[PDB]
Amino acid sequence: ERKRVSKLMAYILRHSPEEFGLRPDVEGFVSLNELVNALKTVYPEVTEEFVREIVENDPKGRYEIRGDRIRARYGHSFPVSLDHEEDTESRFLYHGTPRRNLPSILKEGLKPMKRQYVHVSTDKIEALETGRRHGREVVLLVIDAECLRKRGFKIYKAGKNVRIVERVPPDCITLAV
């Protein structure tokens, strides 16, 4: 039940709020009341406290509540003005992806694709688990974070391990494992 409701929250908060009549503010927030009411049209037993539980217990840091408003911290496919802190300390960052994507990435770098930002991770396991969602022969990309910063692509702390960055040029990918 938690996972099914969380997946619908991510759909609403990252991709298609307008399908439920919701319009996030410029920071990506909708009111908690609005979200609960939207979830109840699919899952009527859902309550504000069950959503609050999902947010508190989420292992990746998917969601953020500020008072009576809630957003997804990352993953959006519509423009959002996020106020996340910059990651200045990480030396290496990681991105897992199916091997089938590697030829394009070596030419183009990582691109945000359908999302606003490229997503990477401080954590090798999480990076690989993310890649495995997409396919079977996952490669672990090692990314030189200082290479990104030097080129004006600041990295932001979007989640426990999740990091977002405008893009990753291929010169900043040091290894594919």
Swiss-Prot record:
GO terms for molecular function: NAD+ poly-ADP-ribosyltransferase activity; tRNA 2'-phosphotransferase activity. Its EC number is 2.7.1.-. One of its GO terms (biological process) is tRNA splicing, via endonucleolytic cleavage and ligation. It comes from the Archaea. The keyword Membrane does not apply. Keywords: NAD, Transferase. Pfam families: PTS_2-RNA. Signal peptide: none annotated. InterPro entries: Ptrans_KptA/Tpt1, RNA_2'-PTrans_C, RNA_2'-PTrans_KptA, RNA_2'-PTrans_N. PANTHER family: PUTATIVE PHOSPHOTRANSFERASE, TRNA 2'-PHOSPHOTRANSFERASE 1. Belongs to the KptA/TPT1 family. Removes the 2'-phosphate from RNA via an intermediate in which the phosphate is ADP-ribosylated by NAD followed by a presumed transesterification to release the RNA and generate ADP-ribose 1''-2''-cyclic phosphate (APPR>P). May function as an ADP-ribosylase. This is Probable RNA 2'-phosphotransferase.
